[PDB]
Amino acid sequence: SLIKENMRMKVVLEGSVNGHQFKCTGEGEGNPYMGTQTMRIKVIEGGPLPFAFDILATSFSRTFIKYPKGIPDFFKQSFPEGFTWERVTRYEDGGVITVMQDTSLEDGCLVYHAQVRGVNFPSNGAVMQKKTKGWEPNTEMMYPADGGLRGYTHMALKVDGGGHLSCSFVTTYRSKKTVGNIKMPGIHAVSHRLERLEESDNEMFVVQREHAVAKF
């Protein structure tokens, strides 16, 4: 397969949140067939970010989902060309973030480009005040949709003082394949656990890992 048991990734993610422009770069590796990955991320422009890095964390990798025998893997089948994803995330207190992402494969490395735009986060809220504490584990429902997939998520962002902020989104996953076939899965789910491993004081440097497993 073009997707090996060990694969490296690199990412450029840029955009703005509440008018604050930034750019990040990341690089990492994982085992796509075990659904595990780690990435090391630096804020290279606009730092220190005046908002929680957690709102960006889920924008930095669908090739690394452990899919059983019996659920077709849309993502791995999309190579060499790869896939795109487009997401809007809506937070219960009115933040909205739109993300556009491209996934390519270049010289044996997965290459990601993401653009993000967040607006209307309350200035006083946990995101803009940097009072968040990571994401609860969650399950994304995956639906077949006219040759692509729609993912649907309700996630809980932990906040200081024993709170959460709920958010939801729909993701549209599209293949870039111009030659060849894709076997489409049926409805399924993907269980995620996204963990912050390292961070610097002002989140200029973050290391995170994910474990993602598909199920019926």
**For the residues of the chain, what is the DSSP string, one character each?**
--S-SSEEEEEEEEEEETTEEEEEEEEEEEETTTTEEEEEEEEEESPSPSS-THHHHTT--TT--BPPTTS--HHHHTTTT-EEEEEEEEETTS-EEEEEEEEEEETTEEEEEEEEEEE---TTSHHHHT-EEEEPPEEEEEEEETTEEEEEEEEEEEETTTEEEEEEEEEEEEE--SSS--PPP-SEEEEEEEEEEEE-TTSSEEEEEEEEEEE-
Cα-based angle 150, 64, 136 (whole degrees, multiple of 5): 70
The two structure tokens encoding residue 181: 């076939």
Please report, as a single letter, which amino acid is at residue 2.
L
* CA-based nearest residue to 105, from 61, 65, 161: 61
d(CA 37, CA 208): 8
Method: X-ray
Instruction: For residue 180, give the DSSP letter.
Output: S
Q: Given the structure tokens 């968040």, which residue do they identify? A: 132
What are residue 195's phi and psi, to 5 degrees?
A: -125, 130
Gyration radius (Cα) of the chain, Å: 17
8 Å CB contact between 111 and 103: yes
- Quote the distance between the C-alpha of residue 216 and its chain's center: 21
* CA-based nearest residue to 86, from 156, 28, 169: 169
8 Å CB contact between 65 and 42: no
What is the domain class of 1-216 according to CATH? Answer: mainly beta
Q: Given the structure tokens 């630096």, which residue do they identify? A: 42
Q: Given the structure tokens 């997965």, which residue do they identify? A: 110
Rounded to 10 degrees, what is the CA torsion of 52, 54, 56, 58? Answer: -170
8 Å CB contact between 112 and 11: yes
Header resolution in angstroms? 1.2
Q: Given the structure tokens 């939801």, which residue do they identify? A: 168
